[PDB]
Design an enzyme around this catalytic site. Structure first.
Site, PDB file in Angstrom:
ATOM      1  N   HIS A   1      12.659  -8.241 -25.198  1.00  0.00           N
ATOM      2  CA  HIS A   1      11.923  -8.623 -24.001  1.00  0.00           C
ATOM      3  C   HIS A   1      12.087 -10.112 -23.661  1.00  0.00           C
ATOM      4  O   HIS A   1      11.738 -10.545 -22.568  1.00  0.00           O
ATOM      5  CB  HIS A   1      10.436  -8.196 -24.089  1.00  0.00           C
TER       6      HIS A   1
ATOM      7  N   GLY B   1       0.375 -15.828 -30.656  1.00  0.00           N
ATOM      8  CA  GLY B   1       1.294 -16.855 -30.204  1.00  0.00           C
ATOM      9  C   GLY B   1       2.481 -17.078 -31.123  1.00  0.00           C
ATOM     10  O   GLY B   1       2.955 -18.213 -31.279  1.00  0.00           O
TER      11      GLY B   1
ATOM     12  N   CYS C   1       5.356 -14.507 -31.322  1.00  0.00           N
ATOM     13  CA  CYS C   1       6.175 -13.342 -31.098  1.00  0.00           C
ATOM     14  C   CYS C   1       7.501 -13.491 -31.842  1.00  0.00           C
ATOM     15  O   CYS C   1       8.101 -14.564 -31.842  1.00  0.00           O
ATOM     16  CB  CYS C   1       6.443 -13.172 -29.611  1.00  0.00           C
TER      17      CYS C   1
END
EC number: 3.4.19.12
Length: 289
Positions: A38, A140, A142
């Site tokens: 992503h 926070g 990823c």
């Protein structure tokens, strides 16, 4: 409030990947870098992305790989399930003996948390029965990775999404999501917020052995009725069993903790500094005493 650790072996494998205006953590083994696919999505792409297409509209230069103040020129890219694979022009000199493996909920493992790409210690944890992970150390960060070391580093997890319910979803190092979770943004947190009773209870015992007692002073079956109403997890005998050692020291019986909890639930609130009943801590995290 948990307990972090070192493992410089894994910290050397961490890098960051930037695409567009996004930056996340990636895993660097040999001359390959792995990270959530992503990263290539804009906020709008995430509402419904066709990754095959968005990838087509990208090139090796769309990606910046950073190892601190060092750059890893990307010379190739592809996609493996929910993982973005990148080929850099040099291999990680600190690559350990490793293997990728898929696990199951309950199996404990180590996660290296990061604050803005900067390693912040490794934490013990395990995926709940629904394959999500409860742990503030993943907020926070990823892209962080989970693993188990045995003589060889067995990578078993990579963080992808933070659900709004305060729980995280990830994939295995092959890019296959653990559970029904997807890597686009919609509502998928259903049934992901039932409060984990066992942890709340252990957390209460940790409180006792710290001055907190004002909340002290029922049966299983009777208790679970309250568990049902407040969306807490049904306490089992096995759960009571586990809290045995904790009941030992503290001196307060499990059912007497439940009676304590039952009150806090029916009549709400500071405990251990927190004004809320923490449930992200397993009985084991507490046995650090």
């Amino acid at each position: 409030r948990k307990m972090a650790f070192p493992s410089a072996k894994v910290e050397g494998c961490m890098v960051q990947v930037t695409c567009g205006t996004t930056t996340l953590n990636g895993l660097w083994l040999d001359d390959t870098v792995y990270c959530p696919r992503h990263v290539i999505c804009t906020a709008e792409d995430m509402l419904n992305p066709n990754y095959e297409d968005l990838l087509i509209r990208k090139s090796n230069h769309s990606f910046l790989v950073q190892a601190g103040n060092v750059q890893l020129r990307v010379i190739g890219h592809s996609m493996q399930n929910c993982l973005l694979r990148l080929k850099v022009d040099t291999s990680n000199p600190k690559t350990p003996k490793y293997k990728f493996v898929r696990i199951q909920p309950g199996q404990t493992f180590s996660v290296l948390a990061c604050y803005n790409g900067s390693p912040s210690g490794v934490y013990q944890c395990a995926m709940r029965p629904n394959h999500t992970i409860k742990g503030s150390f993943l907020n926070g960060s990823c892209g962080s990775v989970g693993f188990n070391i045995d003589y060889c580093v067995s990578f078993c997890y990579m963080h992808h999404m933070e659900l709004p319910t305060g729980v995280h979803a990830g994939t295995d190092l092959e890019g296959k999501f653990y559970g029904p979770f997807v890597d686009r943004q919609t509502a998928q947190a259903a049934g992901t917020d039932t409060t984990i009773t066992l942890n709340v209870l252990a957390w209460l015992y940790a409180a006792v052995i710290n001055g907190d007692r004002w909340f002290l002073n029922t049966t299983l079956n009777d208790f679970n009725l309250v568990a049902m109403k407040y969306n807490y997890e049904p306490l089992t005998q096995d759960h009571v069993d586990i809290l045995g050692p904790l009941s030992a020291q503290t001196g307060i019986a499990v059912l007497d903790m439940c009676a304590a909890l039952k009150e806090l639930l029916q009549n709400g609130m500071t405990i251990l500094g927190s004004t809320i009943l923490e449930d992200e801590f397993t009985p084991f995290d507490v046995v650090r005493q």
